[PDB]
Design a protein around this nucleic acid. Structure first.
Lengths: 59, 251, 121, 54, 240, 369
RNA sequence: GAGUCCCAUAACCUUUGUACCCAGUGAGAAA
RNA sequence: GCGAUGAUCACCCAUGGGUGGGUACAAAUGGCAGUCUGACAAGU
C-alpha cells in the first residue's frame, strides 16, 4: 500500500488529513464481555459468509 | 388438595378453544341463509341465541327481540333481513342449525359453571391469592408451577416472571434485558397501572403474592376468609395510588 | 336444450370421425373419458368429442365444464359405437380428444374441424 | 420492527444473493434492496395432491 | 411445498410478490382457509394475538390477467377499491383473483352465460361476498342493466368474434368516463384466416371506433401463443 | 323532443321529466359529452317527477325478470298511467325515453299514445341518471341502492340458474367437517370424565369402555347403588354391582361438577348421531349414487376431501383417493365411484339406479376374485 | 432497574412401543 | 361365455428363514431446561 511518510502527513491540511487508526493492544471490557453463539449459529455464520463471497466474486 | 385446579384450568383453555371452532362452523353454516348476521353481530352465544329465537328472515321480519342484541343492532339486522344475498333454508337443515345453536349455548353454560367451580375450589384452597391476584390468574400460577407448595417455596421474583420463561431465558443466555410481567400481567392491579409502573407494581404484586401464597400453603390455623390477602391487597392498592399520583411533567 | 346439447348432424359427424381416425393413426388421439379429462387439465387438447348416447350421460357431461373453463371446443357425436370404430379400437369409446401437435401432418384438417364445431358452438 | 428484522435478516440476505446459490439457476438482473413493508410466510401445499411438491 | 417466502408489495396496488428461489405472483385471500381451483397458498402470521392471514398464488398459465401482470403492464385499472365488470367469467378461476385484488370495499360483477359455470360462480360468491354473479348474455346488456350500476373497469375475457361490440355495449352502459377497459384478445378465436397482428390491429381500430383509447398492448407470449391484452381507457370525448 | 324518461332500478321505477333537451347535432362534442359527467349541469336537463318503490324483493325479482325479457309489468303500467299525459295515438304522441329497444314495443302495446326512444341521446340521458343515481332522487327511497343491487343480482342469478339449496353439497361438507371435530371433542371430554371418575372406582372404564355408555351410567350412579335392574342399559351390570360392593377408590361439590361434565358429554353424544342421521339423509338426497356405491359416511368424506361434489365429479378417475387383487379393487372402485359421482352431480334430481348398477358391477368384480 | 400479552397455556428432537412402505401409465388380457 | 363405461405395470440363502430401516403416532425428570436485580425512591 501507499506508505505516506510521517513528516509529510503531520504537515498536511485539515481536509487532507489521513485517518489512520492504531491497533488495539488492551483487552477491553466490551470485547471481553461480548458473547458469540456457537454450533448452529457459527455454521450459519460460516454459511452466510460463503454465500456472500461467492456472490461478490461472481459479480 | 388442588390436583384438580390444574385439571379445571386445562379444561378451561381446551373448552374455550372448542367453543371457537363450533361457533365458526355455526356462523358459516347459517351464513348460507343469512350472511350479514355473522358480520353485524360477532358474539358466538348471541349468534346462537338469535338463530334459536328467529330462525328465518321473514320470521325475523315478524318477530322482535331485546334480551339479545341490545337496542341498536336491531335496525341493522332488520335491514339486512329485508335485503340480503342469502338464500332460503329448509326445515330439515334448520333443525340441525338449531341443534348446533342450542349445543353451543349449553357449551357456554357449562363454561361459566366450570368457572364457578374453579372460583370455588380456588377460594377454598388458596384464598389469599384469590383476594390479591384473582381466581383464574392464581389458578394458572398454581397450575404452572405444579403444586401449591412448589409455588410457595419460590421467591417473589420467580412469581413475577413466572409465565415468561422463553423470553427470560433467551434474554439471559444472550445478555439482554429480561421481561418484567410474565403470567402476572393479567392481574387487575397491573391493569390499573399504566406506563413503567406496571413493571413496578408487577414487582410489588409478586412480592405480596409470594407473602399471601406461602401463607396459604404453609398455614395450619388458616380460616379461608381472605384476611392476609386483603391486607396485602390494601398495601398494593395504596402503593399503586402513590405511584399513580406522581407525574413526570413539571407543573 | 338437452344435456348433450351441441350435437353434430351427419356431414359434420363424418368429417369429425374421419379426422378422428387419422389422428388415431398419427398417435394424436387420446381416447376414453378419463384420458380425455387428463389431457384437458394438462392443456394438450385441440377439441374433445363426446358421444351423446352412452348409458348414463353425465358420465361424460363432466367434460363440457372443463372445456368451458379452458376454452376448448367440444362436440357431441351421436354414436359411441361409430366413435370407437373411428378411434380404431375394438370397443366403443364415449369420449376422445385431439392432442395438440405442430409436427402433425393433419393440422389443416384438425383446424378446419375446429372451426366448424366452433361456429356450431 | 428491527427486532424482527434481526430475526429474518439472514434469509433476506439469501434472497438478495439468490444468484449464487445454485450454479444452474441464473436469475434476471435486479438489485432487490430490502423492502420497507414485507411479511414472511409459509407455503401451504394443500391436502389434494401428494408426493410431488410435498 | 412447505418452504418459506417473503411477501412484498408489487407496483400494482393490491397484488404482491412472494420471493423465494422462484418468485410467485400472489394476492391476498378474501376467503381464508380454502383454495378455489387448487392453487397453492401462503399463510403469514401478521400481528389480541397475531392472526393467520393467507395469500393465493396467481397462476399465469391459467389466467390471462396474471400473464399480463407478470409480463408487465404499465397500468391495470383493477385496483383495491374499485368496481370491475368481468365479462366472460368462465369459472371462478380469475374472478377470484380479481375479487380479492379489488378487496372487501370494491365490487366485481361476474357476467357468465353458461349455467354450470354459473352454479360454481354462485357457490364461490358465497364465500367471496364482493362478487355479484350475473348469469346473462353479455351481448344484451339491457337484460341485466338493472343489476349493475357504474363500474370503474371492464375486463373482457370473452372469446367470441363479436367481442368489440360486446365490450362497446357494456362500456357504454356501465363504464364511467376515463375508466379502464382491459381486453384479452385471442386471435384464433376471433378469426384464423388472417395473422395475429392483423386481428390485433383490427380490434384496436374497432375499440377506437367505439371511442376507447388504447394505451398499451402486451402480447403475453411465454404463457399463451397468439394472445394479447389491450389496456385502454374509456375516453368518451376526444381521443384526440 | 325526449319529453319523459323511464329509469328502472332495483328499488323501483322512476319517471323523470326532461327539462332541457341536449343537443342532437352536437351530441358527440366534448362539452356535450362531459355535461353528463358534471352534476351541476345534468340537473339542468333532468328532473324527477315520480318514483314508485317496490313492495319488496319478491316484486323486485318479478320486475327484474320482466324488465330483463322486455315486458311491461303491472307496476310499470301503474306508474306510466299515473305520469304520462293522455296524448293522441295519431298525432304527436308523448315521447318516453327508455334504454331498451325491445321494451319499447311492450310499452306501445299498452299505451298506444306513447312513442318510445332509445337511441344515443336517450342512452346518454339514461347513463347520466345512472352515473348520478342517489343524488337525483332527493332522498326519497328506502334502502341503499347498491345494497338492493347486491340482493337483486344474487336473486336474479339463482333464479336464472335454478339454484336449489336441497342439492347443496356445502351442507354435507360442513356436516362432516363438524362431525370430525365433535368426534375428537366427545373423545377428549369423556377421557377426562373417565379420569375424574377413576378415583371413585377404576373399573367402570374396564367393564364399560364405550364413552357414551360409561357417561350415561355414571350420570345416575353416584354411590353404592344393589337394585341392579335399571343399569343394564346383565352380566356387566352384575359385575359392576359386585365392584360397587368391592369399592376400591375414594366429594360432593367435585362430584356434582363431574356430573355436569358427564351431562355435557351425553349432550355431545346425542347431538352426534343426530348429525350423523342428518348427513346420511342429506347424502341420500344430494349424492344417492355415491352413497349406494360406498356408503354415506364414506361418500361424505370423499366429497369433503375433494372439496365439492363438482370437484369430485370433474376430477379424473385415476386421481381419486378412496379409503394385487386388494390393490386393484381400489382402482376399480375408484373409477366406478368417479363415474357415480359424475352421474350424481350433473343429473339434476338424481335417482339411485345407477349407483345400484355400479354396486352390482363392483360386487361382481370382487366376487370374481 | 429490567424484551412476555407475539402461543413454557408453546415449539422441536431422541431411548422405547403402534400401522404401512422402499400413484401415474395407456391396450391389452385369456388360451 | 374380457376391455377406453379402462387391460396392464435398501443386503444373503437351496413357498419359507436370515440383513437396513423409515414414515405416522403414545410415553419421555436421557433431553432442549436454566426460573430476573437487590436498597433506595418520592416530596418540601
Amino acid at each position: 500500500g501507499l506508505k505516506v511518510p510521517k513528516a509529510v502527513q503531520k504537515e498536511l491540511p485539515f481536509k487532507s488529513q489521513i485517518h489512520q487508526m492504531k491497533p488495539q493492544k488492551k483487552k477491553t471490557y466490551m470485547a471481553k464481555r461480548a458473547v458469540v453463539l456457537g454450533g448452529d449459529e457459527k455454521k450459519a455464520r460460516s454459511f452466510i459468509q460463503k454465500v456472500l463471497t461467492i456472490s461478490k466474486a461472481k459479480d | 388438595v388442588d390436583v384438580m385446579i390444574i385439571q379445571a384450568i386445562a379444561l378451561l383453555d381446551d373448552l374455550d378453544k372448542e367453543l371457537n371452532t363450533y361457533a365458526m362452523r355455526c356462523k358459516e353454516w347459517y351464513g348460507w341463509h343469512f350472511p350479514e348476521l355473522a358480520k353485524i353481530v360477532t358474539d358466538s352465544v348471541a349468534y346462537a341465541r338469535i338463530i334459536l329465537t328467529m330462525g328465518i328472515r321473514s320470521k325475523a321480519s315478524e318477530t322482535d327481540l331485546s334480551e339479545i342484541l341490545p337496542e341498536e343492532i336491531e335496525e341493522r339486522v332488520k335491514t339486512a333481513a329485508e335485503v340480503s344475498m342469502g338464500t332460503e333454508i329448509t326445515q330439515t337443515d334448520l333443525d340441525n342449525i338449531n341443534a348446533l345453536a342450542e349445543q353451543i349455548v349449553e357449551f357456554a353454560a357449562y363454561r361459566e359453571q366450570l368457572s364457578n367451580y374453579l372460583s370455588a375450589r380456588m377460594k377454598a384452597i388458596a384464598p389469599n391469592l384469590t383476594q390479591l391476584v384473582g381466581e383464574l390468574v392464581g389458578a394458572r400460577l398454581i397450575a404452572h408451577s405444579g403444586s401449591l407448595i412448589s409455588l410457595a417455596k419460590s421467591p417473589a421474583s420467580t412469581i413475577q416472571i413466572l409465565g415468561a420463561e422463553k423470553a427470560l431465558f433467551r434474554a439471559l443466555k444472550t445478555k439482554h434485558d429480561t421481561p418484567k410481567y410474565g403470567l402476572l400481567y393479567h392481574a387487575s392491579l397491573v391493569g390499573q397501572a399504566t406506563g413503567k409502573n406496571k413493571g413496578k407494581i408487577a414487582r410489588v404484586l409478586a412480592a405480596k403474592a409470594a407473602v399471601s401464597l406461602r401463607y396459604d400453603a404453609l398455614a395450619e390455623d388458616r380460616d379461608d376468609s381472605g384476611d392476609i390477602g386483603l391486607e396485602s391487597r390494601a398495601k398494593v392498592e395504596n402503593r399503586l395510588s402513590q405511584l399513580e399520583g406522581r407525574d413526570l411533567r413539571t407543573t | 336444450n338437452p344435456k348433450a346439447f351441441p350435437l353434430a348432424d351427419a356431414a359434420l359427424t363424418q368429417q369429425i370421425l374421419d379426422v378422428v381416425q387419422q389422428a388415431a393413426n398419427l398417435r394424436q388421439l387420446k381416447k376414453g373419458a378419463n384420458e380425455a379429462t387428463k389431457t384437458l387439465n394438462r392443456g394438450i387438447s385441440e377439441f374433445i368429442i363426446m358421444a351423446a348416447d352412452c348409458e348414463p350421460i353425465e358420465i361424460l357431461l363432466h367434460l363440457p365444464l372443463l372445456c368451458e373453463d379452458k376454452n376448448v371446443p367440444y362436440v357431441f357425436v351421436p354414436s359411441r359405437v361409430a366413435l370407437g370404430r373411428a378411434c380404431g379400437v375394438s370397443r366403443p369409446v364415449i369420449a376422445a380428444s385431439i392432442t395438440t401437435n405442430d409436427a402433425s401432418a393433419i393440422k389443416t384438417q384438425i383446424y378446419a374441424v375446429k372451426d366448424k364445431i366452433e361456429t356450431l358452438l | 420492527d428491527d427486532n424482527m428484522r434481526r430475526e429474518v435478516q439472514r434469509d433476506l440476505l439469501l434472497i438478495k444473493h439468490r444468484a449464487a446459490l445454485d450454479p444452474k439457476r441464473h436469475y434476471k438482473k435486479q438489485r432487490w434492496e430490502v423492502p420497507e413493508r414485507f411479511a414472511i410466510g409459509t407455503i401451504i401445499e394443500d391436502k389434494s395432491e401428494f408426493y410431488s411438491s410435498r | 411445498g412447505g418452504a418459506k417466502v417473503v411477501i412484498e408489495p408489487h407496483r400494482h396496488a393490491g397484488v404482491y410478490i412472494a420471493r423465494g428461489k422462484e418468485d410467485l405472483l400472489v394476492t391476498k385471500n378474501m376467503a381464508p382457509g380454502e383454495s378455489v381451483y387448487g392453487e397453492k397458498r401462503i399463510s403469514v402470521e401478521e400481528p389480541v394475538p397475531p392472526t393467520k392471514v393467507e395469500y393465493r398464488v396467481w397462476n399465469p398459465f391459467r389466467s390471462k390477467l396474471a400473464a399480463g401482470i407478470m409480463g408487465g403492464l404499465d397500468e391495470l385499472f383493477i385496483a383495491p377499491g374499485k368496481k370491475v365488470l368481468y365479462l366472460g367469467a368462465a369459472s371462478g378461476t380469475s374472478v377470484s383473483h380479481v375479487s380479492d385484488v379489488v378487496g372487501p370495499e370494491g365490487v366485481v360483477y361476474a357476467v357468465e352465460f353458461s349455467h354450470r359455470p354459473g352454479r360454481e360462480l354462485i357457490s364461490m360468491a358465497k364465500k367471496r361476498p364482493n362478487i355479484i354473479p350475473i348469469i346473462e348474455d353479455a351481448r344484451h346488456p339491457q337484460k341485466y342493466r338493472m343489476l349493475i350500476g357504474m363500474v370503474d373497469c371492464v375486463f373482457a375475457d370473452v372469446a367470441q368474434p363479436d367481442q368489440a361490440r360486446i365490450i362497446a355495449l357494456n362500456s357504454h352502459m356501465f363504464l364511467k368516463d376515463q375508466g379502464g377497459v382491459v381486453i384479452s384478445i385471442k386471435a384464433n378465436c376471433i378469426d384464423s384466416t388472417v395473422d395475429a397482428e392483423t386481428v390485433f390491429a383490427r380490434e384496436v381500430q374497432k375499440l377506437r371506433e367505439e371511442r376507447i383509447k388504447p394505451l398499451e398492448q402486451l402480447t403475453l407470449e411465454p404463457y399463451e401463443r397468439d394472445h394479447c391484452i389491450v389496456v385502454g381507457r374509456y375516453m368518451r370525448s376526444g381521443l384526440k | 323532443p325526449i319529453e319523459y324518461l323511464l329509469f328502472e332500478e332495483p328499488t323501483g321505477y322512476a319517471v323523470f321529466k326532461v327539462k332541457l333537451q341536449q343537443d342532437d347535432i352536437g351530441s358527440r362534442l366534448k362539452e356535450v359529452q362531459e355535461q353528463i359527467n358534471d352534476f351541476g349541469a345534468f340537473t339542468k336537463l333532468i328532473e324527477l317527477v315520480s318514483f314508485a318503490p317496490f313492495k319488496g324483493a319478491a316484486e323486485a325479482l318479478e320486475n327484474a325478470n320482466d324488465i330483463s325479457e322486455g315486458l311491461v309489468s303491472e307496476s310499470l303500467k301503474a306508474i306510466l298511467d299515473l305520469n304520462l299525459p293522455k296524448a293522441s295515438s295519431k298525432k304527436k304522441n308523448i315521447t318516453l325515453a327508455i334504454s331498451d329497444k325491445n321494451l319499447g314495443p311492450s310499452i306501445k302495446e299498452e299505451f298506444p299514445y306513447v312513442d318510445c326512444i332509445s337511441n344515443e341521446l336517450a342512452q346518454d340521458l339514461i347513463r347520466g341518471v345512472r352515473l348520478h343515481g342517489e343524488k337525483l332522487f332527493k332522498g326519497l327511497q328506502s334502502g341503499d341502492l347498491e345494497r338492493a343491487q347486491l340482493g337483486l343480482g344474487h336473486a336474479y342469478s339463482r333464479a336464472k340458474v335454478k339454484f336449489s339449496v336441497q342439492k347443496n353439497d356445502n351442507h354435507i361438507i360442513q356436516a362432516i367437517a363438524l362431525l370430525d371435530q365433535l368426534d375428537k371433542d366427545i373423545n377428549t371430554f369423556a377421557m377426562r370424565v373417565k379420569e375424574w371418575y377413576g378415583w371413585h372406582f377404576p373399573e367402570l372404564a374396564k367393564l364399560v369402555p364405550d364413552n357414551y355408555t360409561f357417561a350415561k351410567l355414571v350420570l345416575f350412579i353416584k354411590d353404592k347403588a344393589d337394585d341392579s335392574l335399571h343399569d343394564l342399559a346383565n352380566e356387566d351390570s352384575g359385575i359392576a354391582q359386585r365392584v360397587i360392593d368391592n369399592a376400591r377408590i375414594s366429594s360432593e361439590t367435585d362430584m356434582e361438577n363431574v356430573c355436569v361434565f358427564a351431562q355435557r358429554v351425553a349432550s355431545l353424544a346425542d347431538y352426534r348421531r343426530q348429525l350423523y342421521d342428518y348427513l346420511c339423509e342429506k347424502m341420500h338426497t344430494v349424492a344417492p349414487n355415491l352413497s349406494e356405491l360406498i356408503g354415506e359416511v364414506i361418500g361424505a368424506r370423499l366429497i369433503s376431501h375433494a372439496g365439492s361434489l363438482t370437484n369430485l365429479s370433474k376430477q379424473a378417475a385415476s386421481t381419486v383417493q378412496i379409503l394385487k387383487n386388494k390393490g386393484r379393487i381400489s382402482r376399480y372402485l375408484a373409477n366406478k365411484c368417479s363415474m357415480a359421482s359424475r352421474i350424481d352431480n350433473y343429473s339434476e334430481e338424481p335417482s339411485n339406479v345407477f349407483g345400484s348398477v355400479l354396486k352390482k358391477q363392483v360386487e361382481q368384480r370382487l366376487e370374481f376374485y
